[PDB]
Symmetry: D2
Subunit: 461 residues, 4 copies
């Protein structure tokens, strides 16, 4: 659409596309921050809409906003939440550090749309006003941090934690299914004392269970909302009940335990809750990296690696059977590296507040919500396209066990340490199995070896 | 478009949207890696198209590909380069770690489109074939690293370096314009020996000049291309002249000094050139962070900060004059934090190669090209919306100078160290200017103070 | 001047005046990398682990009373600082910490032998592997020592110093609760708040950090000891794991428990990756607090200057008030260090393979360094800076009353447009708000003094 | 047992048997943070800086010959290792390095006084500020010492060890140029290459890293000395900056030059941020090389096992061949450390304000540690692992000939579909390619031996 509409702010008039719902301040940000391609994610836009919806409801309860306007703002916000206005939010992450410009983007879009819903028009003849109505009782300084925490807490509760629980359940099923399959241990990459495949997988399960607890511990701080601190944390120019009322309303409409931040100065001056919560996410990334690496190394082959397990083959040469890459493991290890880098960017932004306001906020939330998407969707993908189909290669597992030198300790009680060690040394030096070396020395019979060397007795319970 | 077309690969048939040009392998990747929202950037898609265009030209020179097909592939690639097919590349960053799936995305789109250009159709009756024709003489293992370096070198040469030079020129102009404006120094955040505003800005200029050299030093390694190493680096199944010929052709069509990598094993097994080049970019981020912080602190006010300079005010309360935030400085400091995090993700991916292939490649190039966009566009934005308009506040600069205790050293040659120190101590203890303290003690006249205390004599040349 | 000690590789000369043995001596010849060694906290945690292992082995009838008691006595000597020069090995050693495990086994065996009337060296009465390492593997001993050192350092150094600094700042916040000052957002002048309110933000940050650190302690309290080589506990008494964790809890008075999954305990450093996440959070908070302090104290004349801080370093007599905020500088530097240490830890923690993580010396080197830096940094910042923060009341009032920010107090009495006109005139002509208001004739001096009350603008 | 030394803050007791003075003693009371101190390389670089400054001051007629010579003699004693215990200050000090500058000024003044027949303490004949610090500021001395230490460590330790390891691996690549082995991509079996070709990739990585490190040296060679307090050189002789850089170049034999812009030199650590970028590149390359070595050596029976490496540690006699790849573990651990150190350096380097960066002790602590780790790590990996890499020729051949990858050699003789059918049958039925081909009757044993030549598949 080439045709324009003239929108105004305190700086003057500026042309906006006639087919868009934003206003003058959005247009100025769009034109002045042509930096790369990263924009606010949908989760954050939705959290801003939820914040405005709750603010309008409380302003109406307090007699500060008319019922007609409050209902129109709620309806407009619900359209945003329903996915009807994604193209109305064009602003970059790399904008003002308070996120003021995205606050104004929501104020302008909701005001112009609410005006239409009341039978009016968009633009300067609108019946609902971005600052006086949609931003009533609020500051950018308290709205943007509120939307950050709303988006973060809902993403953790609704996407990440459920996918973590699902992957954990799958691996727990596999651990139980493979509880009796003895395999060679590996420490330092070297052959080691045996354990069952179920025991090894139980370590992955325990890692994921511990990670869930650490993530859960980070949620109460993210649930604290800045809204009501206004410009600098004092709440000047707001009703004394606004802060608690809006947190309560957000809790009602999201079914999440939002509360007003007990100290609004900490809430405005820092991103500390997200620095801490992201600490738990980088812990999960380190655990997932290890699990993903174990899976791809154990599946490596078809003939010149380890090959103890098989995994689903999801992408396609017919001349090369068994030559499909562990692509889910690769995607997962890549995104785990991304989370580690994202943690550094978050830490730098979080360490860089000054006085009453941290102004590194768009960058912090860009990284935080990205890590949540990566970890949630990555666990979902790895689970459905790899973990549910892990299977042992029982003959290969047994071949490696039986060709190893590690089972020699089963001989000690029968023939003594000295002869057992002589057998292991001969097998290693001459390239023999333990059985072949033991028979060559005449220290036992084949029936004795088969009776005495029992891997299923070497793994505890 | 709901209607589908059945596309085939060695795994079988899969439905693709009838209005799209990709094929079976793209569709499988699209469906199996539903991870977050990050896709290949346009610069990388273009670099893949350039690589296929050059490969087709050389295959034709060598008699391996018909003129009719080579010209059709070139035409299709030129359509990609002209921006006609951006929606034909739907794949995620978080895919197979070799980038094979994006290689196949380009093979399939170019084959289906080249078929149409020859009077044929898209799909399984096509006249041009993704693997046999578009991927002739190539492997994913050597194509994706080639596209990574093509995209990286062109982005550095065409976007980042020109914007760096432009910002450097602007600050050099400002340094010359303000060469005679003496201001208070600040070390440890404390008042310090004076220097000129031009001298202070000359430090910013020298930083940017040094950064340009460091970036230039990283370009020769990025210019080395893997293409011709094929699956593992040996060049098996390729003409002995292919590697040099394709690097030469890429050099011709891009006007950049691409060369074939002297060691294809290093070229496939690592991302070392990009790890090193990104080291120079994180150096630039640290320099830009410092410059941006100096600008916003020096402009801080209007009345309770430093206020030595003014900057353009680009976004809008009429009740609050002088209360506009340094928003370009905020966007720039935020993206500098991002580059630091991106460096960690790149380092982890680059450290994580195994044997013949590094399979962290989509993640590495995602971060690398993002840092280039951020630094290039950030310098462009900061220059045009802030740096070109920096101005001194001469009265405020002089007020701070004259109210400081630092000019007292100008008295030493006239009245001696002991009396000068007595004056400074009295001024500090009693809250006086140096002049008022000196007159109160009777150690000089006002005319003597004005004649002797000359800041323009205290900054060298 | 030397004696000959032996292991399975043969004989090797060891300094006669040292208590280590053949394996420690070999490590000194093969891992000559940089200067970083095991810190005292880790050496002590290793000695505690061996003391507890010896006690449990005695309880189970696996180790004689005379040997177990002599091992415990030698371990107590290490804990008492008598053997600091007996642990010469680099951080940059075998990734399981085997070499440092053997260093402790050899030193304790040679010393225990002397306590039993014997000698050090190959004629010793107590043996590094058969006695001091009985029921153990390096694979489970080293992560046990890591967690013992980490939990005790958090409980005994970091958490007390965090509480002490928090209490100081809470006292300052109360003392300054009624001092109104200009706010600053985006570095620009902003709506007022009290100095006490601003400091209460620092206090709330430190209180939140304490909770996050406390949440990390239960996982660190889980011990690998008893998992043996790969986690199955093969060749170990079924009660060993619980008994040794119980004994460590007794002797340290800390709530150590045996890890419920020994495979997670051996294959990862996850508890420390998570606990260090809380420490880098504290580093980000301390960076912000330290920066606020040095910026608010900046001057003496050309910065902000709203607070004064103690001056701990000399300066030239001709430069009064120039002294640098050096406690803030040391603190901001160590906060950067913690951020880098977190990356090193994350890479090590992400890099386990199969049954064992072999990045352990590096992980614990970084973790214990971060604890020392944060604990000692908070102690130093508290004692030498925070306890002495004071307001510069005249400067605070000068900045507040000469700013443009108090103009909002006029909106309810005169027009918002009149108030805006006052602010624009003051800014344009370099006037105070009061002077611009009197020049426009919009109010009396009595009206301005009655209407513009900063103390009514901080709620 | 003590003497009383004085500064502008008053008198303070200093140990009689030490050579520092009042300001160093105060730092010891105010910066009791952790255990990290200035490394020897930095102490030596500080002594060299003072030696050069004294020589130039003498040349310019600003310092007497007897004092300048005594200062140079005392500095030479520091360089000769006679005063290591005279530098007790923490890294975590004033961010400009002022305290360590004063530590050197006091030690050199007190010792120079003794060399002139005087005493240490307040009756000294040579003075820390007026003599040893003449023409200097802490602001320009500390970054000069940082760059002197960094450039000399890169030239004398890191670059020689990098060249030595590269030469070893180049010899191995030539020795193994004809040993065909299976390729591995995505961890999966892949097209063959020679062991020599695979090692040539490691060699090319190290050669590229050397070039990147060399490109960082010119900026590190630029020295701040002569910029004085804020970069203007106020109160300093106009020739001082060039003369002191020249003298440092003479005495160190390294190409030091004066920084062309002293404001960049004082306000940033940019040269070290950039140089450390090349070091983290080397860390990423060494991580990959070390991982290839330990994976290729993995076994003795249940891994890859294509190469053998020296066994430097003992093991139990019942566990032959189990020894861990411990050099690879130390090297991968220190590579993680370098990555973390880079983050700490980047944060410090990004955090300058106005005329001075005050994150300097932390930046140089990390930078010099990374140099020690990489230099010593490359020395250790070379001597104790790389020189002893050998192929396991039978295992290499077993993996290669039992894989499915050589089937492509049949495409030109029989059908591609026949070759594909052979591979599918071998994979399905657990056969070799040759056995599956003979079972299908698609060729003779002579034809397979003639056609399937791995040595013709590596070009």
């Amino acid at each position: 659409m080439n045709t324009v509409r003239s929108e105004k702010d305190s700086m003057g008039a500026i042309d906006v596309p006639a087919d868009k719902l934003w206003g003058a301040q959005t247009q100025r940000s769009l034109e002045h921050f042509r930096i790369s391609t990263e924009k606010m994610p949908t989760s954050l836009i939705h959290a801003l809409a939820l914040t405005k919806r709750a603010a309008a409801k409380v302003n109406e309860d307090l007699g500060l906003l008319s019922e007609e306007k409050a209902s129109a703002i709620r309806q407009a916000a619900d359209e945003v939440l329903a996915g009807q206005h994604d193209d109305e939010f064009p602003l970059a992450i790399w904008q003002t550090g308070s996120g003021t410009q995205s606050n104004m983007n929501m104020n302008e879009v909701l005001a112009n749309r609410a005006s239409e819903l009341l039978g009016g028009v968009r633009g300067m003849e609108r019946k609902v006003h971005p600052n006086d109505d949609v931003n009533k009782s609020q500051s950018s300084n308290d709205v943007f941090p509120t939307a950050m925490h709303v988006a973060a807490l809902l993403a953790l509760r609704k996407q990440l934690i459920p996918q973590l629980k699902t992957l954990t359940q799958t691996l727990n099923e596999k651990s139980r299914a493979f509880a009796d399959i003895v395999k060679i241990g590996r420490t330092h990459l070297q052959d080691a004392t045996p354990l069952t495949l179920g025991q090894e997988i139980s370590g992955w399960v325990a890692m994921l269970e511990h990670n869930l607890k650490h993530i859960e511990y980070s949620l109460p701080h993210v649930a604290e909302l800045a809204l009501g601190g206004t410009a600098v944390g004092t709440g000047l120019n707001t009703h004394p009940e606004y802060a608690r009322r809006v947190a309560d309303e957000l809790a009602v409409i999201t079914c999440a335990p939002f509360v007003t931040a007990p100290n609004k100065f900490e809430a405005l001056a820092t991103c500390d809750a997200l620095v801490q919560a992201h600490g738990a996410l980088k812990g999960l990334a380190a655990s997932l990296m290890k699990i993903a690496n174990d899976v791809r190394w154990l599946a490596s082959g078809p003939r010149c690696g380890i090959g103890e397990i098989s995994i689903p083959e999801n992408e396609p040469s017919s001349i090369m059977p068994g030559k499909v890459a562990p692509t889910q493991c690769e995607a997962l290890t890549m995104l785990c590296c991304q989370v580690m880098g994202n943690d550094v960017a978050i830490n730098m932004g979080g360490a860089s507040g000054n006085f009453e306001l941290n102004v590194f906020r768009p960058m912090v939330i860009h990284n935080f919500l990205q890590s949540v998407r990566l970890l949630a969707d990555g666990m979902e993908s790895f689970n459905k396209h790899c973990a549910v189909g892990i299977e042992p290669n029982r003959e290969r597992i047994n071949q490696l066990l039986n060709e190893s030198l590690m089972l020699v300790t089963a001989l000690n009680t029968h023939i003594g340490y000295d002869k057992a060690a002589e057998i292991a040394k001969k097998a290693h030096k001459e390239g023999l199995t333990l059985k072949a070396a033991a028979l060559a020395l005449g220290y036992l019979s084949e029936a004795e070896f088969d009776s005495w060397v029992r891997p299923e007795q070497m793994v505890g319970s």
